[PDB]
Paper text:
Importantly, the crystal structure for one CDCL from [name] reveals that it exhibits a high degree of structural similarity with domains 1 to 3 (D1 to D3) of the CDCs and that the residues of the conserved F/Y-F/Y-Xn-YGR motif occupy nearly identical positions and make similar contacts in the [name] CDCL crystal structure to those in PFO. The crystal structure of the [name] CDCL shows that D1 to D3 are highly similar to the [name] D1 to D3 structure and D3 exhibits the characteristic αHBs of the CDCs, which refold into the TMHs of the β-barrel pore. Importantly, the position of the F/Y-F/Y-Xn-YGR motif residues and the glycine pair are nearly identical to the cognate residues in PFO. The significant diversity observed among the CDCL putative binding domains suggests they may have evolved to bind targets specific to each species. The CDCL did not form oligomers on liposomes but appeared to form stable dimers, whereas CDCLS formed SDS-resistant and heat-stable oligomers. Mixing the CDCL and CDCLS resulted in a larger SDS-resistant oligomer and exhibited higher pore-forming activity than either protein alone. Single particle analysis revealed stacked oligomeric complexes of two, and sometimes three, rings, with one exhibiting a slightly larger outer diameter than the other. The conservation of this motif and little else in the primary structures of the CDCLs and the crystal structure of the CDCL from [name] strongly suggest that these residues and the αβ loop are similarly critical to their pore-forming mechanisms.
The cholesterol-dependent cytolysins (CDCs) are bacterial, β-barrel, pore-forming toxins. Membrane-bound [name] monomers self-associate into toroidal, multimeric prepore complexes of 35 to 40 monomers, which undergo large structural rearrangements in order to form the membrane-spanning β-barrel pore. Finally, these studies reveal that the CDCLs represent a large family of pore-forming proteins related to the [name]/MACPF superfamily and are widespread in nature.
Numbering used by the authors: 34 to 59, 79 to 485, 492 to 516
Amino acid sequence: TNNMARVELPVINITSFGTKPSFLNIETKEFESSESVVLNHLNRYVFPGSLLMGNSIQDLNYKPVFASLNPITVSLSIPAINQNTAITITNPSLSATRAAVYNYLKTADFTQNGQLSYSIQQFSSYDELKVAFGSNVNSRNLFGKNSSSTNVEEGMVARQSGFYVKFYQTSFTLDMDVPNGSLVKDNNFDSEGIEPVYVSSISYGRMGILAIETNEKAEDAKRIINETFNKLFYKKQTNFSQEEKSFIEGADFNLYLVGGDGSTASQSFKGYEAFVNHVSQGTFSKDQPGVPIFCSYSYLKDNSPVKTKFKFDIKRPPLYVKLVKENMKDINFNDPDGGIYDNKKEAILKIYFYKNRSLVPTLPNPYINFKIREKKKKWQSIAPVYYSSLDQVPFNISERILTKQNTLQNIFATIQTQDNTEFSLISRIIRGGPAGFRAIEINDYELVEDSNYIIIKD
Ligand code: NA
């Protein structure tokens, strides 16, 4: 009605844990998007010219501003068949858009599958999927991740590796010409003091965001996902390999589908049959030609593009480590209680790397330093000495700090402690020689406290 304030859209702050979208750095990262996925409950507000409260778009809590609008001219493209046609919509509204579109399509050549696209991103927090939606939508709620599993933080990838596949089929697009003058006819409308935005570009069709958690290794998961999407989604081919089918059988899949008929589907699944049902190309027709899957907005005053700003706070992935004695061999070389008792306890030391206290594996980068203390207690006597417990033995104590990295890039590492063998000496105890202690060598190995990891001692 009178003057209007431009509400600055806040920077969307995303905390991630070792992950970011592939298009970055090519810790903190700032970047921008200009397309927003249109959840299908909002489709009625997403049409060329649609006027929305300027402070209501980033959280997707669209609030329309009722106003009388001048005619608008849009380019209607079917990109799968490189067709472009200009149409003027005299009275911008949802229903003016649909009447123009449906009427054009009844006579036009169309597309069965539209223009295909997919892209893969790694992620660790479900907040990061906000990037794929191009808004501050609560992606945790959309994927069912706003509750805490016992001893695994809420909103997180639970398995080793998380990936999301944003994939969509664009049947047609609507792109406004920049208004030559005023988008609105008269400035009596009530925008509650706030400069509004209007919808200036829309892509139509169907879109999914497929969340994939898996315990396979990130490098192999990215590869398998990409190759199966290429084969199935791009090339309509179901002949997968033995490697692909088994990854599909073991991965957790969570699909958020912006259906091309207006429906919204959240589907969890597993298995090659399900994967082929949900990743196969949808099909369009003239009576179901697609619905808004993403859009872009422009400011009313100056038609300038509304930008959604993202700031990733990339934290270090959580690292839990457990020292474990494997292939334990305990040999009593003799023991007749006629002098001799010789026990040699040997094991292969392994550190296992974990994402959380539920023992989900992780693969720390090869530069993180793991420290293991070898506390050697050594004690000898020519004749056997009686101690009620080993606490009372006057050990010659000595310590080494062993340093190890995940050189071989696995979810565990063997800690070699001696030349030309993988075995560590845990204890050599000789008794009698008679029924007391003649020689005690025990190595107590324990992880050393460090800021780069949390020790699980179990
Ligand atoms: Na939608």
